[PDB]
Ligand binder design. Structure first.
Ligand SMILES: CO[C@@H]1[C@@H](n2cc(-c3cc(F)c(F)c(F)c3)nn2)[C@@H](O)[C@@H](CO)O[C@H]1S[C@@H]1COC[C@H](n2cc(-c3cncnc3)nn2)[C@H]1O
Ligand SMILES: [Cl-]
Ligand SMILES: [Cl-]
Ligand SMILES: [Cl-]
Ligand SMILES: [Cl-]
Ligand SMILES: [Mg+2]
Length: 138
């Protein structure tokens, strides 16, 4: 039981081999969820499950620079279910973020923002009950 939207500080930003783990439960009749890895006002990595975009479930990922969204990267593999407990793991790798949901690889997102050590906050928003948000090095 964390309040959403939630901000998780990432002290000194991110680095390869840093693992961020988000645990929560999707609300019944969910519409949207977002994780925003921020570099100040920029969004280095936005990870955004949409439960009803034109009656399809899709994951949208993108980057926001100087208040402008870039080119979306879309994934129709959709591992979330309304009402169910989930685990999102975001592993920072040298060239990409790697995302696994419920221990199954979902997607990678190549780094657009290159100053990894300035990506110093993770925002968590949308239609979830949030249980925990933490990080470790592996
Ligand atoms: C509603 O605005 C979103 C942005 N967004 C989401 C949130 C958000 C905030 C929260 F508090 C949340 F809890 C939360 F989950 C999400 N805040 N900003 C962000 O997700 C951004 C990422 O690019 O998208 C915009 S909507 C963007 C607008 O312009 C057209 C884009 N469009 C449509 C299609 C297309 C392609 N193929 C098939 N069908 C439709 N393709 N592109 C569309 O996706
Ligand atoms: Cl959205
Ligand atoms: Cl659903
Ligand atoms: Cl940068
Ligand atoms: Cl930041
Ligand atoms: Mg590569």
């Amino acid at each position: 039981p964390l309040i959403v939207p939630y901000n998780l500080p990432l002290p000194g930003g991110v680095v390869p081999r840093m693992l961020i783990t988000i645990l929560g439960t999707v609300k019944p009749n969910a519409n949207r969820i977002a994780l925003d890895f921020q570099r100040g006002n920029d969004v280095a990595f936005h990870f955004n499950p949409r439960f009803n975009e034109n009656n399809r479930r899709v994951i949208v990922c993108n980057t926001k620079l100087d208040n402008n969204w870039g080119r979306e990267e879309r994934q129709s593999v959709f591992p979330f279910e309304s009402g169910k407990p989930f685990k999102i793991q975001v592993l920072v790798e040298p060239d990409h973020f790697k995302v696994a949901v419920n221990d199954a690889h979902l997607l990678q997102y190549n780094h657009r923002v290159k100053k990894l050590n300035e990506i110093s906050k993770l925002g968590i928003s949308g239609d979830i009950d949030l249980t925990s948000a933490s990080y470790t090095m592996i």
